[PDB]
Amino acid sequence: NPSTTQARVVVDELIRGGVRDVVLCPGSRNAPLAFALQDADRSGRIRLHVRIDERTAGYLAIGLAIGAGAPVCVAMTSGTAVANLGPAVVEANYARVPLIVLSANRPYELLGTGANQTMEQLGYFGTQVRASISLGLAEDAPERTSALNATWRSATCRVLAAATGARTANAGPVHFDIPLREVTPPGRPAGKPWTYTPPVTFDQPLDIDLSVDTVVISGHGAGVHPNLAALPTVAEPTAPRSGDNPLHPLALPLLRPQQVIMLGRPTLHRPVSVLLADAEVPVFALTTGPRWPDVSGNSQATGTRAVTTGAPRPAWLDRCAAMNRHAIAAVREQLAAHPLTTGLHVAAAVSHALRPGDQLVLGASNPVRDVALAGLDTRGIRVRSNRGVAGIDGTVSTAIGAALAYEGAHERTGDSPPRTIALIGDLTFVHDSSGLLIGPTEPIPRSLTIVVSNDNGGGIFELLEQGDPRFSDVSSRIFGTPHDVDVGALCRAYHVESRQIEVDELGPTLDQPGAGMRVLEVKADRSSLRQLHAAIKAAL
Amino acid sequence: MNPSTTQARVVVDELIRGGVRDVVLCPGSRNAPLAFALQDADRSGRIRLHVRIDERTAGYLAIGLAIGAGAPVCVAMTSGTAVANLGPAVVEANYARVPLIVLSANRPYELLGTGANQTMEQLGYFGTQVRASISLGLAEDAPERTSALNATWRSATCRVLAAATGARTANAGPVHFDIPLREPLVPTPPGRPAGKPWTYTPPVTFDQPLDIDLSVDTVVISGHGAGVHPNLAALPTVAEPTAPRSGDNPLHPLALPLLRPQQVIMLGRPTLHRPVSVLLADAEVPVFALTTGPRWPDVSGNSQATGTRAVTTGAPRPAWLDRCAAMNRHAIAAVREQLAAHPLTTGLHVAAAVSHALRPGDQLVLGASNPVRDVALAGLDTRGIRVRSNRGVAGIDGTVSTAIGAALAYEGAHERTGSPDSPPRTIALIGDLTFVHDSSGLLIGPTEPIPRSLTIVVSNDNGGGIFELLSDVSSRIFGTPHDVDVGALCRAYHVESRQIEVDELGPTLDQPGAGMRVLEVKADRSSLRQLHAAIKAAL
Amino acid sequence: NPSTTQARVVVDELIRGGVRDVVLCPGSRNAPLAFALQDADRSGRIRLHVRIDERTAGYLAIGLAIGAGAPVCVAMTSGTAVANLGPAVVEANYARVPLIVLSANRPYELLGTGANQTMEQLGYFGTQVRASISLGLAEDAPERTSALNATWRSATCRVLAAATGARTANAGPVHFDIPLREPVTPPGRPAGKPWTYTPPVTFDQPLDIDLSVDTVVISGHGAGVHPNLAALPTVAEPTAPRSGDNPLHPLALPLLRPQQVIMLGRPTLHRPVSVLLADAEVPVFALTTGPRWPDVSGNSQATGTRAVTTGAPRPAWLDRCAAMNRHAIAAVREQLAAHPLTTGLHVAAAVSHALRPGDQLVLGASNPVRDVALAGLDTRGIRVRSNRGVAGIDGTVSTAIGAALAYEGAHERTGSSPPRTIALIGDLTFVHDSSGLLIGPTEPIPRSLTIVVSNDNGGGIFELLEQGDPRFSDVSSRIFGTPHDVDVGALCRAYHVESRQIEVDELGPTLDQPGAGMRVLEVKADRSSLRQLHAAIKAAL
Amino acid sequence: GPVHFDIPLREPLVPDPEVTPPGRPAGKPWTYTPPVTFDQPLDIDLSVDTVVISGHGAGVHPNLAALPTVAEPTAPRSGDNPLHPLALPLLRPQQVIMLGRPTLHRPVSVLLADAEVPVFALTTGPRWPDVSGNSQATGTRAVTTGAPRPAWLDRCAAMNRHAIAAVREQLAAHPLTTGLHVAAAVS
Ligand SMILES: Cc1ncc(C[n+]2csc(CCOP(=O)(O)OP(=O)(O)O)c2C)c(N)n1
Ligand SMILES: Cc1ncc(C[n+]2csc(CCOP(=O)(O)OP(=O)(O)O)c2C)c(N)n1
Ligand SMILES: Cc1ncc(C[n+]2csc(CCOP(=O)(O)OP(=O)(O)O)c2C)c(N)n1
Ligand SMILES: [Mn+2]
């Protein structure tokens, strides 16, 4: 059989290319490269992860990818695989995550006369993936074994480079097909990839004068800019910080910046949106990759670097620092004044408990905002959130995958693995609750703690226009969506340790390692959420 | 003004700020707002407009206007099959990395599925072929929103321009810019101060250094899109005609099989030569791929590495250089002796004569099939001349229009330098089937710009010459000479044309003549196999 | 060889399905089913047409399909094949013509690492085709020849049914891929029957309509025939089949107030028609075949396939409509007589008057198809074609040639001199597809095709519209008139096509004479006066 | 089938403090399209020994009620002559009438996979299943000729009894409750 050789060559090149983890789902036909993948899994060269739910599996792959920054494969086998992987692939595209989807088409069967129970295709692969590469059918030619080895490894390297953005700096999902009919040719010496791609730079310098009153907004994907380290910075949680001059999100409406340097892709805070769209404020977008964020079209220039002249006026820095202290104290004070535990209270407790070396996975909705409003100093901590499309789906498996990948990185350097802490809301937890179902044969994280802040619904709609009390009569059912799930019972069903705790007990519980993967539920209230935010700004 | 008019004038203004000097317009009622705005911009001298009937050849006219001087070019056409006709040029623009903006009018998107006349699935029609598919919002009559609408329209236009020119990706290519338009179609918020683009995105520097040891016996193969590598100038280089040459040590393509290079540096995208293609399919020979953008060719399965430039240790063996230099002379001398010994005139004879007539400063446009390869076999020295050829997919469509657009843009850049000299020559070499196939590219309205110094040389062996160099029942049409009268075609489109024999070619190219003219040279293809077999036996 | 057997089975089942003509273009690689198609063309079982121009080749196939209603294959095999065939496929989709696009993937070759020699893909296949079917590679086991023969013929019948709308009544293009690896026939059903037999189908959606209400019928492209609507005043587009003998001239519509409208097929002509179909005071009843119904304004009251009528039209309404019909015919005829210069409307009137039953008329887009409607041609007994799906001016010469060849082939089967096919196109339309005149001596050539070119050196239709207002006079000339000065005669001579420039009163006698070949008649026409001619017609209504 | 109705929306997204544009009189649809009647008659001769396999989405056929029928649970049964799935591989029908979209049984798939038995596909809509390489024809209903042979009905009835008895006897003798036991209980 020529295909097993091909399959083992591909897997070998994938491993040479930094793939440590592969996610599989069972289905009616054999997974692509399965024997080669189980060969490699037994020998320890690669770590397989099996799940029954295809959708949580794709998000597990995303977590495995963003946990340490490596490409990961997902190889699946059903008439529902393409449909269930859809959400993860859209997130991989928009968040620029290197996710390799493996398929195994069959050139000897008919296509288009009915239902294919591999790869039932939808319409999103055209728009979402960086590349779509299929090897040829492996054929009978001992005579051609050297050339076919050269072709298979080159194409695999082409798949890896497209997914990681090695030459484009635009990482994203790739569709990789290894067709099937139904002593392995060596790669390069010393484990070198067949086609080596040396490091790449994309350089677009923009002139910027810092004497103009300047604020920095940094969002998802933002780079690190040392020449902007001292500027007042409104940094989203997932944005790596350059310096030590934070500007709280709620101080922005009280300031009038003359120009904005926006790093990466922002998605949080309406005052950020209004400032970005203000026609009188020049906006400089510094990002990596082909496109730039600009919902209003108001931006003046895009590039990758700033070349700076001048320095900010001290009165501008002084007043920015003053409003920053004004806003932080307003939140602390009204949190102390507010009686009922809310998700904002939980976020502050989680932030205080964090320490350098931690990984923090944040859910969408109020959790990722609340951490920003709690004012977490994110330096030394690696913050992950699925900001590409900001869905409330797949966050449990994302956190599981990130902790596994981050812990795997801790092993290969030869103490106990670093903590990974996830803060998610109750709806988000319910959405991806099947991520908790992990078989005994599958890898399980050692230091994953998932904090669920449960206000029995979506607290975020209490802060929006539909949260207005003129909508008190109608907002609860179509926006609040209360559900009454028993989180403790759910975690017990999947044999995952869980606990109810109060916000003041959170730090002490998080300190101690705990028996592996655990859930801590904190009860929260969203009826007082609108007033609580009303009180915080009312103190500004 | 009504919304479609304002929006069309905003897009045209931002396109001009973004460096668009030439626009190809195809007639239609739906694109009246853009047609009117484009015409007014042409009358003011801000752009040069070019009206064409046939959208497919118009697309290749846009390509020629783009490759002639390296600017982004926009082609505008109405909804319906006029957009489907841009398909072939878009595929060429994709594979040749040509900044072609396809600006299509459209009906509102909610009219799809309603049986509206002349409406189709336009957005996404080109799929993977384009760098971006961007659509403007149907303009609405909100007089308060006009300032914000102006920002969004100019911003989307800057996104279109950056994707087309590869301003952030370093990978220029076609872009589809779709504007849904509503009635009335028949009749301006300002941009940035000082004529700057609305969103200023400077051209990126894309850098990928790569270590290569030159004491290893090394040959360079440079194809379409190759960059200039001064640290590789001394090396023996098998350079395609469209490849710009770093140095002065050419290596004839037929000399390659007579050599044993220890390693190969591949520049850009090689397309042309069977000895090249064989050598690159040799797993045993290491190939390093250097390119100007993120893409790199899959022609060799043993591409060891990728880069944009080389970091060189060492120098080539003087004996290696001496030997490669000898084999190069040996190869080109075989060609020239077998051409002299050949009784009949062939397209290879015509390409040799054309190469001899060129002078530095000329632009040379080569058609697919035998012309572009015949020029390489004839040993053309390309330094100082700009050589264009549609190497993306190497089809026969649009070659005449590509030669015309390239001449026009090459001449416009020359007026720009301020020289009072005659504009520089553009000389094209295309086969007879290619010329007949795109003969309607000769059509230019009386109002429309006409090249001032374009000579199209048609090498006419009355059929498909390269098929001697070897099937389907599809090949039966080639088994019979077509007998299409090239002269009659040229008068149909009121273009000066003359037959000449091959010795008149040099002297005839030296006299300027009409701004655009066609020189037909009769050739023989019945002896082509004999000639080529005599060349190989002489090596 | 497994591939070889597969190819002859597929070609044999296509023939059984009614495929008479296949269009091929030479390319980088060997066409789909090339050897099987080559054998069948020798036996006279199938007829091949080869062109170098891939765009004109798709429109040639459209013509061969609409000439007699037969499904047509295009086997095209290059890196620009999909791009050039796009216009033809879009037209086949919107006009519902059975166009089977044949391809041949190589599963043993890589995809997506660069340019594809076989099939460089665009984004339109996924939205324009009724189906995408791909055979398996022919596996090499002789125990299963009977099993593989059944699978291949079943799949080929599935391709044909999708293309002809045999079960859906929604004909259109389908993509048929027969994969291949470089480098006696299992028999089909007895008596030449298709492997999977699709007996006749009916989609029945009756709509209740009261004809006592003042009713007008607008029938367009794809319209059916309705005997219970034969008496109604009917504004019929030239491609629409007539159900009755009570026509209503398009220019007479704005002079009347129908209380309700029955719309047949897909209307694409006349602004008074679109205004009336959009009038919220007028209930519109759409009777079409197929899944969708035309309704740009969304004003339509109901859609179905058939009408169940009560009552009859008031005789006052009939005489009112008949009287406006007469005034409209009178206005066109007199103002044409009173106009000194020859326009395309003059040419369209002359072509109409020369037509006789049994003719095939092929109408180009723009003014020609409208002008024939303005001349009040009686389309009964006439087969009228026009590419109204997208109404492009591209590909019309090959569409006329293909339709002439298909219509002549059906006549050759009767055993009976071939019937006339007469084409009327504008000069821009001719210039667009002039390369379609290039037919090799190896290739089928019509015997009775006369292409009439009405040449006003530009697009005359833009004189009539928004851009034709004299206030726009300076700019509009260049961007809408698009004059070109092409010498049609020199162009035809270059392609060895008999051609002559004649005055319009010579048109009738010349068309009656047998030209015994494919030929091109050119009539010089003026468009500078087109706007005032039409204004004079309207004033005489 | 499913359709995708996408609605672009922008702020303000919530109602303003309170006039809805009306539809047609009398609650009628804006554009009224009655449900189509899709009809494709197909001649079948029932004296040839026939089995009926009914899949998901199968129609109801009175003129086929006498024929031995293997009907999936979702198939709306119309006949009075059931044939158990396990009796199919012990029968050799001369022709097969296939209703709707069969999906459930391997022997059904095996029988339909055989290229030697003619299959007639009777469906409710334009689609028809490709599970059989030897589908002679398609229809919506059958125009029957003849009647099933008495000897053929006896065999099918006889093998049907065996299959029912085998399942019933072997469930009764099995020591452990299985999912098949749960299914019979629910049934
Ligand atoms: C898949 C998906 N569905 C719906 C939404 C819209 N949405 C955004 S936030 C939110 C509420 C999330 O509630 P929860 O996770 O409990 O967080 P909380 O706001 O209560 O802290 C919803 C439904 C989404 N972002 N993704
Ligand atoms: C491999 C390949 N073969 C054929 C074609 C189509 N094609 C390309 S060149 C050609 C004939 C070229 O003839 P001509 O233009 O006279 O130039 P010559 O080769 O005779 O010099 C054809 C049919 C193609 N696109 N690709
Ligand atoms: C491919 C394509 N491009 C552009 C158009 C827009 N268009 C419609 S009519 C027309 C003018 C046609 O001129 P001609 O064929 O000479 O007919 P005339 O108006 O002179 O009667 C144009 C350009 C179209 N319908 N199809
Ligand atoms: Mn909640």
Ligand SMILES: [Mn+2]
């Ligand atoms: Mn030639």
Ligand SMILES: [Mn+2]
């Ligand atoms: Mn005209």
